[PDB]
Design a protein around this nucleic acid. Structure first.
Length: 78
DNA sequence: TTGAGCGT
């Protein structure tokens, strides 16, 4: 139901790469990685929106290895 | 090049 955030994301990692990973847990609507609009390099974190609530907690209920680094899905601070 | 945090 809510937009999740992911911390610890490697720098080279991209949006497509996440879809590959989170699409293993369930219905992914969108993903957006945060970058500098001058370089396009990733801040090391992004967001992710699922369709089902089951798949969201499952993801928020654990840590995730991504690009060779562990990342934690948390509830944000809109 | 970098590694806690929180979305043009």
């Amino acid at each position: 139901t809510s937009d999740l955030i992911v911390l610890g994301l490697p720098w080279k990692t991209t949006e497509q790469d996440l879809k590959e990973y989170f699409s293993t847990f369930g219905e992914v609507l969108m993903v957006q990685v945060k970058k500098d609009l001058k370089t396009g390099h990733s801040k090391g974190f992004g967001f992710v929106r699922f369709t089902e609530y089951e798949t969201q907690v499952k993801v928020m209920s654990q840590r995730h290895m991504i690009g060779g680094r562990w990342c934690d899905c948390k509830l944000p601070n809109s």
